[PDB]
Each structure stands twice: as structure tokens, then as C-alpha cells.
Design a protein around this ligand. Structure first.
Ligand code: HEM
Ligand code: HEM
Ligand code: HEM
Length: 70
């Protein structure tokens, strides 16, 4: 889906999946060879990938509550 909701014990995360493709050139930057559900998706994968990219690019939320907005 273009907008994906991630339930979380630390607050739901609203992910603009489609919008992110306007900023991220490759599906592979977040996906395995085949784009689709990510088997090991969770805290570790998310904090490394989601937070990590935001940190390196200086755009996107890195503060807990700015991502865990639910
Ligand atoms: C045009 C390239 C992309 C394609 C073809 C693609 C395709 C998909 C598909 C088919 C799904 C599964 C939807 C479902 O659950 O039915 C999905 C989920 C997802 N995609 Fe993408 N995606 C692309 C780019 C991105 C990018 C750039 C990111 C990271 C910024 C990303 C992150 C994710 C995440 C986190 C999920 C949820 C996985 C899960 O809940 O297991 N995608 N994507
Ligand atoms: C599932 C993991 C991710 C989550 C939960 C996430 C969440 C967010 C959120 C909450 C925003 C605020 C703007 C919006 O919602 O559209 C955002 C912005 C952004 N994200 Fe992510 N993101 C993820 C992965 C990534 C990745 C992997 C990259 C880089 C490869 C990335 C690059 C960006 C950039 C550049 C922005 C700023 C866009 C703007 O200027 O409006 N994000 N992201
Ligand atoms: C240091 C600040 C942060 C703290 C304390 C925090 C804490 C947590 C915790 C405790 C979990 C697991 C909750 C559970 O078991 O359901 C989690 C999962 C996650 N976090 Fe964070 N987080 C932080 C920052 C971020 C940021 C900045 C993002 C988005 C850019 C983010 C995205 C996520 C996502 C998508 C998950 C996985 C959700 C799922 O299981 O589907 N977190 N976080």
C-alpha cells in the first residue's frame, strides 16, 4: 500500500511508502531482491534502516516520538 501503518508498543508508525520512492531511488535500499513483505521487519530492522537513512541524509525523523506518532 502507498501508506503503511505499523502498530508498535512504543506508538504506531505511519509510513509513507509510495512517497518515499520520490526520495529513494531503489526499492532494494529497503527490500530484499524481490520487493514485498520483509520477513525480519521489526525494531532492529527499522531502527537500522528507517532511522539510519534519516540520520545520514539529515532529513526524516530521528527523534523517537517524531516517528512513533501513534
Ligand atoms: C519501487 C520500489 C518498491 C517496490 C516495488 C516496493 C514494493 C513493496 C511491496 C509489494 C510491499 C508489500 C505490500 C504488502 O504487504 O502487501 C512493500 C512493503 C514495504 N516496503 Fe516497499 N517497495 C518499494 C520501495 C520501498 C522503499 C524505498 C522502502 C524504504 C524507504 C520500502 C519499504 C517497505 C516496507 C518497510 C514495507 C513493509 C514490509 C513489511 O511490513 O513486512 N519500499 N513494498
Ligand atoms: C520503514 C522505515 C521508514 C520509516 C518508518 C520512515 C518514516 C518517515 C517519516 C515519518 C517521514 C516524515 C515525512 C513523511 O512521513 O512522508 C520520513 C521522511 C523521510 N524519509 Fe523516511 N522512513 C523510513 C525509511 C526511510 C529510508 C530507508 C530512507 C532513505 C534510504 C528514508 C528517507 C527519508 C527522507 C529523505 C525523508 C524526508 C522527506 C521530506 O523531505 O519530506 N526514509 N520518513
Ligand atoms: C531512540 C528513539 C526510539 C525509541 C526509544 C524507539 C523504540 C522502539 C521500540 C521499543 C520498538 C519495539 C516496540 C514493540 O515491541 O512493538 C520500536 C519499533 C520500531 N520503531 Fe522505534 N524507536 C525509536 C525511534 C524510531 C524512529 C526514529 C523510527 C522511524 C524513523 C522508528 C520506527 C520503528 C518501527 C517501524 C518499529 C517496528 C514496528 C513493527 O514491529 O512493525 N523508531 N521502536
Amino acid at each position: 500500500a502507498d501508506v503503511i501503518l505499523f502498530p508498535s508498543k512504543n506508538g504506531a508508525v505511519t509510513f509513507t511508502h509510495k512517497r518515499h520512492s520520490e526520495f529513494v531511488r531503489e526499492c532494494r535500499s529497503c527490500h530484499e531482491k524481490t520487493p514485498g513483505k520483509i520477513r525480519n521487519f521489526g525494531k532492529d530492522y527499522a531502527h537500522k534502516t528507517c532511522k539510519g537513512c534519516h540520520e545520514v541524509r539529515g532529513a526524516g525523523p530521528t527523534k523517537c516520538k517524531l516517528c512513533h506518532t501513534g
